[PDB]
Each structure stands twice: as C-alpha cells, then as structure tokens.
C-alpha cells in the first residue's frame, strides 16, 4: 500500500487525504523521541525506542503544554493560533504530507513552528503542509518541540535541565528526517528547514550550532533571526529565571538538584500559571524561557560566531513583515485595542517606547523617541501609533534580521531578501495593525487556493508564486526558475543589498530595506548604551 | 544750517550726501569715547572729554584693529567684508544718516556690525545708511566698537582687563544716542538696535544685561543670538586664553598686572598675528575673544536669565538665513573651495563634523553624524556637502536663534520671525554656498535700489518690502501696517510658532523652524553629551 512505509523506528500506516480535487497521503503523529514525562522533564530528548506493529499515524499528535491565549475568545483570529489538541507533555512528534504518487527523491521542507518559544503547535490549520506538498511535488514535514519551561529551562551546569532541549528536540526531528525521509520519497540531502518567528529564530540558530549544521541543506527565515534580542539569553540569566520560577512555587532552591526535583513535582498548568511572572523588566515580545547561549549548542556568542564566519554556508531566503510590532502592542501596550483605530497620546506612545526597549535608560529612551516622532506634528495619533508599530518590528525583527542577512551574506553561498506587505482582503483584525506577524504564513502553506475561505484572485496567484518561490528555492537554492519570462528575484549582495516586496502588484527590486532605522538600532543605539 | 548741530559733548559739522536722485545729510566719525590707547587698552571706556570748537564730521573714522582676509585677495566678494579706512585703536565713533528736511522726533535705527567679534566696520559700503534714512525717514546710526584680544580679553578680578569692554564700548554709543539723537531729530524713546551675526547677539546681550536695557526700545536680530555657542565663554575659559596668548609673546605671566602691562606694550598687528592660536580646539564658527558670562555685564548664565524671564521685555523681530554654514565651511573645512562645486568624500564629511562640533565625544559625533546622513546614499557628495553646510548653521546659528526665541516669547511683548532665503541674482560666491551669512544685510541696506548694482526689479521690490518691515516694526513694535491690503506678518507665538519666508514670491506662512533638528541641537545632544 502507498500509505505502509516501513522506517528506521517502525512501519506506519498513514490515511488518504483530500486536496483541491485531488488526493494525497498524510503520516500525522509519528513519534522522533521518547515521552519527556517524568524524571525526564527538562531533560535532553532520548531517541524514541523502536516499535514492532504499526504506528497508526491516521491523525494528529497532542499539541505540547502551553500558554493559551484567552484575550479574545471566539475570536478567529486569535483561536487560529492556539493548540487545537488535548495539551501534553507528551508531544514530540511530526507530520508528513507526500505526494500521490509517492515520489522517488524529491525536495524535502520541514517546517519549524513560531509562538516566542512559550507557545507553539504543528498541528494547526495554517500550518496544512498538504496545499504545499500537492502543489509543489515536495515532501512538508512539520515537527513539534517542547515550550516553555518543558523546553527551556536553563539551570547551566546541571544535566538535569541543562537548557536549549527544544532546540534539541527540533534537532532530533531533523535526526530523523535525515535518517527516514527516504523511505517516504524525500531525498535527505535536499532538505530545506523553514520557519516563522521564533521558528525563523530556531531555523538561524541550527546553521549556528555545529550540531545541527550536517542535517539539513539549505533554510528559510521568516520573521525571525537567531540574534533576535527577545531569543536568546546567558546562562547567568538563564539561572536567575530558573531560579524566580522556583520561587513562585514555594519551592526549595538550595541546590540545582533540590529545584529539579520540585519542579518536577508539580502539574503543567502550575509552571504556565506563573511564567510571565519571571521576566525581569516589564515589557513587550520578551519571553521568559527562551534559548540559552550554552558553550555547547552555541560555542560562542551569536555575534562572535557571525563574524567570523562560524556557521553553514548554503543558500538562505527570508525576510520580514511591513508591520511586526502591531500584535504586541494590541496584546500588551496601553492605548491600542482590536475595535478602535488605537490613536495614541503622546502620553501613551512614551509608555509605548519604555515597554519597548525594556533594557534602556533614559538618555536611550531619549534617542529613540526623537528617531521616531515627527517634531512637526508631535500629537498626531495615528503618527504616534504607526510609530511605535515601527519601533517595536524595527527593534525586535527587521533590523536584527537585517544585521544577520549582512553577516551572512559575506560568508554564504546566496541570500534572497523579501519584504512582505499585502494586507489581506479577508483579515479579521483591524486595519491599524496593518500587514501582521504571522500573516504571511497563509500564503506560503496555500490557503488562498481553497475558494470557501474567501480569498481574492490576485490573492491566490500570489499565495502560487509564494509557494513557487519556496519550493524552487528550497529545490535549487534559487527562487527563481532557470529561464522563465518573469522577473527575476535578484540575489541580495553586500554590494547592493537588493530585495523584492511580495505583493499582488508587479514584482519590484529596492535596496537597503530600512537602513536609516537599522544603522540607529544596529549600530547607535547599541553604542549609546555601552557608553553610559 | 541743517548740517551744523549742538549736542551736549560739543558743535558738530555734517556733510550734504547725494541719494537716489536727492540728497541727505550725514554725521560721520562722531566721538562717543575716549581712545582706548595706551594705559587704556583693555580698560572700560570712558566719556568722550567735550570740545569746544567744531568737529569736522563730513568723513568716515577709522576702523578698529582687526585681523585682515586674505583669503582671497581682490574678490569683491570677501574685500567687500574688510576695513576700508586706515585701523587704528583710535577708533570709537559713531555714524549717522539724517534726513532732509531735518525731522523733529522720527524712528531711532541703531547698527550693530558683526565678524564674529574679532572684526568689523562701521564704515562698509554694504552699512550705508542713507538708503535706509532716506527711503524710511529714519535716523540711522551706526556705532562701532572694539574688537579682538582689544575687546574682549578677559582677566576676571582685574580692573585694568575685566572682559567685556567691547560691549561696553556699545553701550556707551547708545548712551550717546539716548543723551543726544533729538538734537538730530531723533526720538531716544523709539530707539531700535539691529544687528547681524556677533551683532546680532550683541543686541540680545543689550536685552539680557540690565545696565543696558533702558537705553534702547526694541530689537531686531538677525542671524545671531546672545546664547550662541560661539558668543561667549567661561572667566575661567577667558582667563585660560588671556594667558595663553601672553605665553606666545614671551610675556611673564606671573599676574594680571604683569601680563596686561606686557600685552599693553605690543604692536597691534603683534597681537593680531597669534590670536587665533589660542583656542582649545580645532574648530570652525569659534573665536578666541568673546564676551564672557562675569556676574557684572551679565548677573548670572544665560541660559538661567532666559528661564527666569531675567531681560527686557519689548518687541523683536529676528531670524535666519538659509545657508548660514556655507562661509565657515569655504574657509575652515577640507574639501570645499570656491571655485568647484565642492561635492564632499564620506572622509571629508567626518572631518567636517568634528570640526563643526568640536566640544563633543565619539558618541556625540555619531549622533550628529546618524541626524545627518541619508543612509540610502552615503556617498553622494552633494548630500554631505549640503548635510555639512546644514550641521553647521543649524548648530551655530538657528537652533539657539531659535531656543532663544522660544524662551523670550513667554515673556515678552511680541516676536515676528524670518525665514531668508533669497539667492541674489548677482552674487559672486559660488551657487553652492547657497544663502550665505550676511547675504540678507544688503536687503536691510537697501542697496538693490541703485540701479548700477545689478539686482533684478524682483530684487529691488524685496529690498523696499524689508526696509519697511524694519522700519515700521522700529517704529511702532509691529512690521505691518495698520490696515494695508497686503498680506500679514504674523506674529510669532508659544502655541503656534508661526514665521514667514522672505523671498520674491509671494508672502507664505509656516510654523516650526527646523524643529526636528533643533530638538536634537537644544535637547537631544547636549544631554547626550552630560551623561557622557
Ligand atoms: C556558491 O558556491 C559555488 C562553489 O562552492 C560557486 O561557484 C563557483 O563560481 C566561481 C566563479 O568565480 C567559479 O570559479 C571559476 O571557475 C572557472 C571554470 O572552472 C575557473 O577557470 C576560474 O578561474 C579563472 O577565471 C577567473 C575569473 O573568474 C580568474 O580569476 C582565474 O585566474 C582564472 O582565469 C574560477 O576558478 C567556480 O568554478 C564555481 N564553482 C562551482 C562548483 O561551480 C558559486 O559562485 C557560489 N555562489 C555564490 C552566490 O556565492
Ligand atoms: C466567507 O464569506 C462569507 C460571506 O461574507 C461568510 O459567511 C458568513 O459567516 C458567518 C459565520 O460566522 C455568518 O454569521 C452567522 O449568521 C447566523 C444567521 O443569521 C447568526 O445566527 C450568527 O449569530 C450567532 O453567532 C454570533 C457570533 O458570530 C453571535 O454573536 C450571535 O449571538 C449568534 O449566536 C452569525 O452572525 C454570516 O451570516 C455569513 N454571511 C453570509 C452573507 O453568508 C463566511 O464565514 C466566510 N468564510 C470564512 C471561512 O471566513
Ligand atoms: N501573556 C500576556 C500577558 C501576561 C503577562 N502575565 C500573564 C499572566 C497570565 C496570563 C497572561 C499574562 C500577553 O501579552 N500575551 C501576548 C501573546 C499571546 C499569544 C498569541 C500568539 N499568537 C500569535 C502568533 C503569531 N501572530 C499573531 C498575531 C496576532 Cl494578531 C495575534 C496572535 C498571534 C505569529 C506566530 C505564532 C503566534
Ligand atoms: N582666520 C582663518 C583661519 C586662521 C587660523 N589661524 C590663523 C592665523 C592667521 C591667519 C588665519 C588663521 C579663518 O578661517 N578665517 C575665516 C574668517 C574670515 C573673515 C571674513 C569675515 N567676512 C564675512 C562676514 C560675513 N559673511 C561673510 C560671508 C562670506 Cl562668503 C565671506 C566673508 C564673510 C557676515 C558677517 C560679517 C563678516
Ligand atoms: C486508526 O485510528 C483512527 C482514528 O483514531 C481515533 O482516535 C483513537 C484514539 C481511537 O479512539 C480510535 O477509535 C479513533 O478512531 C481510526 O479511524 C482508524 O479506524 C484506526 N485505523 C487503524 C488501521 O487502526
């Protein structure tokens, strides 16, 4: 039968899947490792020990423990983002879409979910690899990896929880890809990793870590870059958290030893309860268990590794959202709401930009609110709120991204830059928040292509030369096809520093994507505070 | 007769001027003080001694001692600039332009030359009061005083060079005008001091200084203001640079008494020679003797005076040219010349900045330099070019012209603010230099109304507008008049801040002058450089 494979781990049984007229196979929740229940709990994942039998992988896994979202219940907009499965903490497992016919050796995606590395699920609508496989004859693998705490709980030094294991989980997955996907119809050695957000992150941070480097060939970035300053933190900082999370549970923090142990004692729901409530600012897009920078996944500093070539050089493609920062400032800034226009006070705007650069003193403050008021019009409200919308994507996303692609591109083998700014026709939030974090996501899985979800026309021919682009790249190492008669997705060089805007008008090239704002949070502002 | 005339220091004797097809009458080289020779070099002024007998007043005084450009010998352009009478520390004289028939009480206009007090004449073609007096029916005085190391050397605590004296020397003209213009049928209670550049600050020192506020009526200052940062320094700073230049004559420096008594016995030109090696920096729009803040001409800071609302509260009407940085530029800054275009090198650039902003740090030149540069093209050599001419007008000339502007408006009687920006048709400096410091001086003048100087119709019509607009503010606080048909100046205010532009075209309005930069200049920097 097409939907029997025998693995490495075991033989499954997949199940028949209906897409736009057609058909395909679909392998959902095959284990990569062992339950981290337990005395396993914060421990590095084990590889999942085999099965005789087989593995019904008719349907999808248990989405992992987390932090779910209840600002706007009902809402779909917000819904479409949280776990639609029986929470677990047994959780680790991948889904893979193949096409029908199975194929011989095609390109593989595996994609890697974003949620700031506390929320997460590779189960959800718009993540369906199914449009993408179907349409692009590629092989879209979707893994899991533990959040939160369950997956970053940084006690440096310990084994017990010695930090970064869902990083190691997303390694394990791509373990077993490498050693598995054959047998599916994937060709291992053209395995192309991407990811939004803090998956974006992860996607980075695997051509960082030697570890990692070997299992996969080339990488998308979307939204996302491994020197975010929200994805990361040092271990002494790592502990300190650690540590506050003990004592928020009346928990003993005499010895490492004595902490695990109770942390180990209590139910998930009592670690989610209290996370947010360790973060040592108060703030916006920080997270409380995050990556930490180890010695071990990362043998030096992000930065140091960047300069000096320390990463894989292949092919990589990203890029970012015209508006990042408006779902954080909905979520957690005073002054902005779903159902108004969220026009903004000065008074409410200087609380925007304290939240914002949490790590900042005063004469910083200072530097970035004269960046970002027009002086000509300083109680302009929609100025005011469009500014801070730019603070938070400009700090947080675009211009550490943008410090990543120059890094790279001097060592890499070819770099694809895009600036996505299509607000969708169909959107449920309000205008305001403008071309949102996560919204390009749905065009690059294809859902534009399904008539009854109401997408325009112009909409699903983008969301066709998206995924085009990605499954060509992810093919090639190039977006482009060898001699089409379209134009051509310029290659971004230190030089020039090209990019295209993915949109529903004409291709367009520009270069420098927001240099004026990334020189002040790349190379000033840094400064500024080092100074004083 | 209409030329001779009895004032209280003795009988003066005038001289029949021709102007415009008519004829006026003018006082030139009248005494207001003692020569400052001798023993009294660096001393206060004292009174003229009266004189029995008739003073021949049909010729031009001396100038004062002053450095000499050289820069570009024979070009109309710069010579236009520099004395045109023997030098002499004889020289503090006053000059005035009365019209025909003698008037009984009209409108007192009193000039204030600039040159950055180390030069100037009261007896320069583009300072010919006639065209004013006669066009306005104004008396037009124009006083002189003492320049350079003779002016300004300040050793705080002596009596025989307390600093300062220079301004004195211009109060001491306008105490003559107070005690004597009605002879000459002025009215001394509708006296307007006027000035540009060192001038121009010069007047709003006469407005902060309470031993000079009741000699004069109302304002106008152009281009230049009392808080300027190269119009004044510490006594230490004074003290530091009095001593300094003994040190380059082989002076003994042991104290005041013997420093001063050595300085008393040089040449002019010996002190002239090595003034401007005294200065701590290597800069541009800094001059070595300057008024100093002593607790005497000024009780307290001036910055704490303007907070305090400490001055004469009056009308003023002042403002800016377009390109104040070009001169300084042309003559102190690598890169630029007179005959290119002077397009600027990133290298260049830099140098320019720390020459233009030679009190800050690293970080504080990263500030200026980020605030500047379009980052899109960084190389273009006309933007650094224009970016430089900007950094340094905008620094020395118009955000403190306008920080004083703001700070005098919540206290006094009415502000009326200009915007220059008229390139004369005829100049002769080079198109890159754009509106040059004291470009706007031979519009006040009158001079576009002789024919045989080439101005266009344009021109002359723009001229006639300012000589009004002076005038009519001299004479009544408001450079409107009453009910005209033409369009109004309107007045500057806290809330609104509205200026206008003066050019050909028709009259326009705006608000906020430079304000993006000028936050950064008055607020941003110089906290930035506090910290640090
Ligand atoms: C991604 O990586 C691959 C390689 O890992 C890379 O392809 C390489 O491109 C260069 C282009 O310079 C090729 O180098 C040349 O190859 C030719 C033909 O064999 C040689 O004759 C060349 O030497 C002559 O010409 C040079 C002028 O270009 C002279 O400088 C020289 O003195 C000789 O006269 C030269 O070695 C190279 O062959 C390929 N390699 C492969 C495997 O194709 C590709 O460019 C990379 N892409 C990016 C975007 O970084
Ligand atoms: C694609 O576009 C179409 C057309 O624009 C769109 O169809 C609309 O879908 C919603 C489904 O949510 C329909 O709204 C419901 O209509 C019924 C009958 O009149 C009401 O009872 C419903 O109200 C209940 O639920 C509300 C919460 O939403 C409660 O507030 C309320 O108290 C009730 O319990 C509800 O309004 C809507 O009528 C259609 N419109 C049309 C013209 O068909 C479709 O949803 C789009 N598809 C997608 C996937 O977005
Ligand atoms: N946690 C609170 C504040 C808080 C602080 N302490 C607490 C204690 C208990 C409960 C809450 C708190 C807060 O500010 N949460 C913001 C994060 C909510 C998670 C939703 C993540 N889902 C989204 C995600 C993405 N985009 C979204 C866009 C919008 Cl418009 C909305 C949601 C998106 C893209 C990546 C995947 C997740
Ligand atoms: N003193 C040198 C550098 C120097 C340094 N050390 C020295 C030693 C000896 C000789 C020279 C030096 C220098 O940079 N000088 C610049 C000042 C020259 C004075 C000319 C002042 N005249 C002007 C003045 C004004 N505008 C001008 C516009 C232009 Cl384009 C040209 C001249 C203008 C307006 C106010 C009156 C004076
Ligand atoms: C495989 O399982 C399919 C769906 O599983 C569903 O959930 C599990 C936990 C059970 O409760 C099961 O009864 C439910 O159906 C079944 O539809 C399918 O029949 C099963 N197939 C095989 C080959 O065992």
Redesign the interface.
Known sequence: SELLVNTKSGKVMGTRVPVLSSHISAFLGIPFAEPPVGNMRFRRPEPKKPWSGVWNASTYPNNCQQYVDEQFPGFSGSEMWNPNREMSEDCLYLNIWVPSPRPKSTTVMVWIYGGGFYSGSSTLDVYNGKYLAYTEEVVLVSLSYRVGAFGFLALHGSQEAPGNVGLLDQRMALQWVHDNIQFFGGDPKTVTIFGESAGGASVGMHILSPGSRDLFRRAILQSGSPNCPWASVSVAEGRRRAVELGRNLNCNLNSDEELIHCLREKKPQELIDVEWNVLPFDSIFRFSFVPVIDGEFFPTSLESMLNSGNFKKTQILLGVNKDEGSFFLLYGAPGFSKDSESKISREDFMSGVKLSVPHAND?GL??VT?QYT???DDNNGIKNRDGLDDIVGDHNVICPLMHFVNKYTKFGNGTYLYFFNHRASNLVWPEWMGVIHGYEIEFVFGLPLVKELNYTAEEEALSRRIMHYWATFAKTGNPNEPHSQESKWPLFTTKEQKFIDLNTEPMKVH??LR??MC??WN??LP??LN??
């Open positions: 004469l200072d530097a004269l027009d002086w000509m270069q420098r240099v004026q020189v002040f190379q000033f400064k500024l100074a004083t």
